[PDB]
């Protein structure tokens, strides 16, 4: 994305949070208006702020916007649970002339304390190896807020291919769960001493390891 937003912001209900949006000399720095959109999970975006500061009719007065020479900010006063969504800033860019968005900001309205994820790593099943396939399954549960980074390692080396990770999804207990998969060749699985999935949650990393020479 051309505009820069924080990956995530959080706050307790009733508090006030702000989401910043910085650009460059060709968009926000050029004096172009900034608009803000809210997107609930699974729905289309909704215009929250237009022309830097204006609220459309129907949008609650809890939302407000401001813009400087370099950045724009969406302010949410009195946090409600319904405000938990992704928020996008949008502006215009003049180049050698397009609409540009920010990367999006996931707002969490904290309804419970932080929870580190539980991590269960599965080696490839014997049945899958017979199909000349091998999939490591990294299952991630019981973390809050719902944002994790997943990296894989082969022995002490970083894995940069064959990784698929799901967007976190809510469990019953309002905590979140995610899953990651490392697709491998049976020869790749058996030739290395170990494999690990590393899940980072709020700067802290949990690492589980499996090995072909030690059945688990």
């Amino acid at each position: 994305s051309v505009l820069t937003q924080p990956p995530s912001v959080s706050g307790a209900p009733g508090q006030r949070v702000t989401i910043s949006c910085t650009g460059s000399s060709s968009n926000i720095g050029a004096g172009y208006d900034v608009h803000w959109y809210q997107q609930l999970p699974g729905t289309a975006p909704k215009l929250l702020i237009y022309g830097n500061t204006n609220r459309p009719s129907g949008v609650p007065d809890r939302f407000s916007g401001s813009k400087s020479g370099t950045s724009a900010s969406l302010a949410i006063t009195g946090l409600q649970a319904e405000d938990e969504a992704d928020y996008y800033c949008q502006s215009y860019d003049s180049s050698l002339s397009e609409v540009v968005f920010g990367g999006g900001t996931k707002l969490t309205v904290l309804g419970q304390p932080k929870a580190a994820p539980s991590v269960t790593l599965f080696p490839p099943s014997s049945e899958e190896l017979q199909a000349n396939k091998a999939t490591l399954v990294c299952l991630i549960s019981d973390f809050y807020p719902g944002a994790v980074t997943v990296a894989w390692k082969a022995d002490s080396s970083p894995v940069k291919a064959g990784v698929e990770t799901t967007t976190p999804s809510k469990q019953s207990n309002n905590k979140y769960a995610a899953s990651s998969y490392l697709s491998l060749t049976p020869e790749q699985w058996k030739s290395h001493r170990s494999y690990s999935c590393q899940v980072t949650h709020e700067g802290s990393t949990v690492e589980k390891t499996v090995a072909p020479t030690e059945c688990s």
Binding site: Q39, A44, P45, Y50, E98, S179
Partner: protein, 231 residues
């Protein structure tokens, strides 16, 4: 009652073309433009272009130039978006939206205003795959991965197309501790998901645990009894 209604979901193979419509109602269609924005799974919003309904002028994102075409039928108050030479990374939900600007004569100021009305979105999946049933593999617990009174066991639902897949355990007799994860679309153009149960250790040797995987698109149902590993 201002709203925009888009056409239904689409599944295409790479190299093909897709055309998505956007029916407008509740306002004078010809006094505004129509903008198109897409969103890849787990990604942000991405502008594609706009078209003015009155004069038919267009402005496309440079990354799609020569590949996208936008048209309007004023007699039916409908805008169209055609994306050609489709590739797997075109998989996204495609939205039409109305920039809140009444064109006074210069149409190219349309993209400068906020989009106040949005369609419901159109899912377009680009994949070389055809209908394919899933392979189900066990995720079995071992004596080492089971330290306490609760053990984790599940089933891996591998390489199916298209969605959806439903998973139950023991035909619905087991719901506590069960979590089925969302499917992930892989670089192969196939889906995979997992479902697990957290279960009391004492029941492992005498209580049967069976994943029930139903994939209606391929007329396939698979029951897989997950037993602990021998190690």
């Amino acid at each position: 009652q201002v709203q925009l209604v888009q056409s239904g979901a689409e599944v295409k193979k790479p190299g093909a073309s897709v055309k998505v419509s956007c029916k407008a109602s509740g306002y004078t269609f010809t006094n505004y433009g129509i903008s198109w924005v897409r969103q890849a799974p787990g990604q942000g919003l991405e502008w594609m272009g706009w078209i003015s309904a009155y004069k038919g002028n267009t402005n496309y994102a440079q990354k799609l130039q020569g590949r996208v075409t936008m048209t309007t039928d004023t007699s039916t108050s409908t805008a169209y978006m055609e994306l050609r030479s489709l590739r797997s990374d075109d998989t996204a939900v495609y939205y039409c939206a109305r920039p809140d600007y009444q064109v006074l004569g210069y149409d190219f100021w349309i993209g400068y205003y906020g989009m106040d009305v949005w369609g419901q979105g159109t899912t377009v999946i680009v994949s070389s795959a055809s209908t394919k049933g899933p392979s189900v593999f066990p995720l079995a617990p071992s004596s080492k991965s089971t330290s306490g009174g609760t053990a984790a066991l599940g089933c891996l639902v591998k390489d199916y197309f298209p969605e959806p897949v439903t998973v139950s355990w023991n035909s619905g007799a087991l719901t506590s501790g069960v979590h089925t994860f969302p499917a992930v679309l892989q670089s192969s153009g196939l889906y995979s998901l997992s479902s697990v149960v957290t279960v009391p250790s004492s029941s492992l040797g005498t209580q049967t645990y069976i994943c029930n995987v139903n994939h209606k698109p391929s007329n396939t149902k698979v029951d897989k009894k997950v037993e602990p590993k021998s190690c």
